[PDB]
Design an enzyme around this catalytic site. Structure first.
Site, short mmCIF file in Angstrom:
data_model
loop_
_atom_site.label_atom_id
_atom_site.label_comp_id
_atom_site.label_asym_id
_atom_site.label_seq_id
_atom_site.Cartn_x
_atom_site.Cartn_y
_atom_site.Cartn_z
N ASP A 34 -3.19 4.35 -8.38
CA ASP A 34 -4.33 4.97 -7.72
C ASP A 34 -4.37 6.41 -8.25
O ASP A 34 -3.66 7.29 -7.78
CB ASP A 34 -4.11 4.88 -6.21
CG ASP A 34 -5.26 5.41 -5.40
OD1 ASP A 34 -6.26 5.86 -5.99
OD2 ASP A 34 -5.12 5.37 -4.15
N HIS A 45 0.83 -1.19 0.00
CA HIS A 45 0.00 0.00 0.00
C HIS A 45 0.86 1.24 0.00
O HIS A 45 1.81 1.34 0.76
CB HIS A 45 -0.88 -0.02 1.24
CG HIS A 45 -1.71 1.22 1.39
ND1 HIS A 45 -1.75 1.94 2.56
CD2 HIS A 45 -2.53 1.86 0.52
CE1 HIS A 45 -2.57 2.96 2.41
NE2 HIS A 45 -3.06 2.93 1.19
N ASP A 104 -3.82 -5.26 7.58
CA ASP A 104 -2.46 -5.13 8.11
C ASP A 104 -2.12 -6.11 9.22
O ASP A 104 -0.99 -6.13 9.71
CB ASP A 104 -2.28 -3.72 8.67
CG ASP A 104 -2.11 -2.69 7.56
OD1 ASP A 104 -1.85 -3.12 6.40
OD2 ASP A 104 -2.25 -1.48 7.84
N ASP A 107 0.14 6.27 -5.64
CA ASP A 107 -0.88 7.30 -5.77
C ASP A 107 -0.35 8.31 -6.75
O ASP A 107 0.63 8.96 -6.47
CB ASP A 107 -1.01 7.98 -4.42
CG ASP A 107 -1.51 7.02 -3.39
OD1 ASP A 107 -2.61 6.52 -3.58
OD2 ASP A 107 -0.80 6.71 -2.42
N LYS A 154 -5.33 9.98 -8.96
CA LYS A 154 -6.00 10.98 -8.13
C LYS A 154 -6.58 12.06 -9.02
O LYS A 154 -6.13 13.20 -9.02
CB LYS A 154 -5.02 11.55 -7.09
CG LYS A 154 -4.44 10.41 -6.22
CD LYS A 154 -5.53 9.72 -5.42
CE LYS A 154 -4.91 8.86 -4.33
NZ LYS A 154 -5.95 8.11 -3.60
N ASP A 165 -2.28 6.21 6.59
CA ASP A 165 -2.39 5.18 7.60
C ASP A 165 -1.47 5.37 8.77
O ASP A 165 -0.33 5.84 8.66
CB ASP A 165 -2.16 3.79 6.99
CG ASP A 165 -3.28 3.37 6.07
OD1 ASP A 165 -4.30 4.10 5.98
OD2 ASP A 165 -3.17 2.32 5.42
N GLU A 178 1.01 -0.43 -4.92
CA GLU A 178 0.02 0.56 -5.27
C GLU A 178 0.69 1.90 -5.05
O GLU A 178 1.39 2.09 -4.05
CB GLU A 178 -1.21 0.44 -4.39
CG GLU A 178 -2.20 1.48 -4.69
CD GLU A 178 -2.23 2.60 -3.68
OE1 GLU A 178 -1.61 2.51 -2.60
OE2 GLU A 178 -2.96 3.58 -3.95
N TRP A 198 -8.74 -3.26 1.00
CA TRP A 198 -7.60 -2.47 1.39
C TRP A 198 -7.47 -2.01 2.80
O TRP A 198 -8.44 -1.90 3.52
CB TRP A 198 -7.10 -1.53 0.29
CG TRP A 198 -7.39 -0.09 0.31
CD1 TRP A 198 -6.99 0.84 1.24
CD2 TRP A 198 -8.02 0.63 -0.74
NE1 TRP A 198 -7.40 2.10 0.85
CE2 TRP A 198 -8.03 1.99 -0.37
CE3 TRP A 198 -8.61 0.25 -1.95
CZ2 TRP A 198 -8.61 2.98 -1.18
CZ3 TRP A 198 -9.19 1.24 -2.76
CH2 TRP A 198 -9.19 2.59 -2.36
N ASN A 223 -0.11 -2.36 4.26
CA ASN A 223 1.08 -1.64 4.59
C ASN A 223 2.21 -2.57 4.96
O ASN A 223 3.33 -2.12 5.02
CB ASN A 223 0.80 -0.71 5.75
CG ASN A 223 -0.17 0.32 5.37
OD1 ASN A 223 0.06 1.08 4.43
ND2 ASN A 223 -1.31 0.36 6.06
N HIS A 279 1.03 10.52 -1.82
CA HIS A 279 -0.24 10.35 -1.15
C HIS A 279 -0.61 11.60 -0.36
O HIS A 279 -1.68 12.17 -0.55
CB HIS A 279 -0.15 9.19 -0.20
CG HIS A 279 -1.45 8.86 0.44
ND1 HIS A 279 -1.89 9.52 1.57
CD2 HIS A 279 -2.41 7.98 0.10
CE1 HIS A 279 -3.06 9.00 1.94
NE2 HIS A 279 -3.42 8.11 1.03
N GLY A 280 0.27 12.00 0.55
CA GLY A 280 0.01 13.19 1.35
C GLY A 280 -0.68 12.81 2.64
O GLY A 280 -1.11 11.67 2.85
MG LIG Z 1 -3.65 5.05 -2.87
#
Ligand SMILES: [Mg+2]
Ligand SMILES: [Mg+2]
Lengths: 285, 285
Positions: free
Chosen positions: B91, B12, B233, B34, B93, B52, B32, B230, B252, B47-48
């Site tokens: 992914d 992830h 963990d 982003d 955005k 998680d 994956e 998703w 993750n 991702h920003g």
């Molecule tokens: Mg993502």
């Protein structure tokens, strides 16, 4: 007379209108909403997943409806008027905008606030608004925003508007200098809020960043008026934030700060900001 | 001979190239990333915040450099080649794109992949790619994407491409039917992945939705080829995901699933997918 630092108790991620009174009831005097964009068009208040633990992430409203609702809660004489609701932060999700969309986005947000929040200057909401942009390079958003207000004959409404340019977080975090420069480029010479939260990416540098910001705010020719720290949700961290000298606590649980502000010690140093505390005024005492 | 369900162990939020081998080393066969956009231009893998727990949120790379690196890790003979790295999910955005920017975004991503990942079919990276879009209304992205490949004479590379349209979350999550229709609108008639678990804003309806998706996948008239769940963990949740019948785990901590897949009563039902497991092939029970 009161020498205590006025604190903004910012309800975090309040994107549905139903939530507004709930957060205000918990004791927030301010709230933060995430303004989503479709191109240059501010569209929703909506955060999305992932979000803070203990929060539903997908509450939302149409932006216009959200602003009109904020107006009801912040217009003296309104049935819904909450005199304790003094500021809101628009966490403007402009991060995906092309360059060509940044100025029109600022213009569109200005138009939205003018029409929906300030009601074209006709007895609009009295709360202060902080435009929180996620990129110091998005200062044209502010230029466009200001240009709309001035052109529509409502430059006075900029009295109610503040700014917080943070980020972007990549390729690196802006220094304070860079941030200050971004304000100048935006034609912003006051009404500046600095937030510190999202990135805990460099813990010791972030401790340093916060202290640097506080020192800068409290410095002779400082440009930062207020500093707010986000997701402070526990008593311990609330106390820490107050004790480090922040002006604003963004929190999922505004009641925490309310309780802390009652506490011996705390209650003689900090107080919940009221409308007469100018959010653009750097605290000195 | 092996009748065990092949599982994609999707690392992830792997947005920095340095992280790639670390996740693969933990046992992921997929990752994956982003893909952020500046208007229609795919810009970063990033991702920003927030992200998680237990994860730094702001690792990043330029999109092309990321794709170049993915190519390296997935080109047989390359120094960095990992034969066990078989798929990545982009992914994408695109949530803030104007309607007019959606198709060009698809075109742009196609060009990036063509130049920097597949190298125009000249022994590019071999991993399968899932284009994960956050709005079933963004089917033009796929139309633009396919257009580019077809125009450039690399329609064959669509063998390596799959699709996951989900969302948006507002005002409601789309039905499976609506999602299917979106595939039809994109001219997508296979290579469909569905992901579940981004939100649990309605635990009951969330449970039902997964069971419905599984039932749909496993139906004779089904359109879904693989389902991935998703952030799974922990061992308990990993086992629960496998046991409910998902084909993919986004995690993750890819090492968790690796351990689970060694366990008795798991190791006879599930196995880590390899390159020869077609990710567009619905597993038949
Ligand atoms: Mg993502
Ligand atoms: Mg926000």
């Amino acid at each position: 007379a009161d020498n205590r630092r006025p604190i903004w108790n910012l309800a975090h991620m309040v994107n549905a209108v139903a939530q507004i009174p709930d957060f205000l009831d918990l004791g927030a005097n301010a709230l933060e909403a995430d303004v989503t964009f479709k191109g240059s068009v501010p569209t929703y208040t909506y955060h999305g997943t992932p979000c803070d633990f203990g929060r539903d992430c997908i509450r939302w409203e149409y932006f216009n409806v959200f602003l009109k609702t904020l107006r009801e809660y912040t217009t003296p004489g309104n049935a819904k008027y909450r005199d304790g609701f003094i500021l809101f932060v628009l966490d403007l999700k402009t991060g995906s905008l092309s360059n060509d969309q940044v100025r029109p986005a600022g213009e569109n947000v200005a138009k939205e606030l003018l029409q929906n929040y300030w009601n074209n200057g006709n007895n609009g909401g009295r709360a202060y608004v902080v435009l929180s942009l996620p990129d110091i390079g998005h200062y044209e958003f502010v230029r466009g925003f200001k240009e709309v207000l001035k052109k529509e004959g409502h430059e006075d409404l900029l009295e109610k508007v503040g700014y917080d340019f943070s980020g972007p977080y990549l390729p690196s975090l802006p220094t304070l200098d860079a941030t200050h420069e971004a304000y100048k480029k935006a034609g912003v010479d006051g009404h500046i809020w600095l937030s510190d939260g999202l990135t805990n990416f460099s813990p010791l540098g972030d401790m340093a960043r916060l202290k640097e910001a506080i020192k800068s705010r409290d410095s002779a020719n400082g440009f930062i008026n207020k500093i707010y720290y986000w997701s402070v949700d526990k008593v311990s961290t609330t106390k820490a934030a107050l004790d480090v000298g922040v002006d604003g606590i963004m929190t999922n649980y505004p009641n925490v700060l309310i309780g802390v502000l009652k506490e011996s010690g705390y209650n003689d140093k900090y107080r919940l900001a009221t409308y007469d505390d100018n959010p653009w005024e750097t605290f000195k005492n």
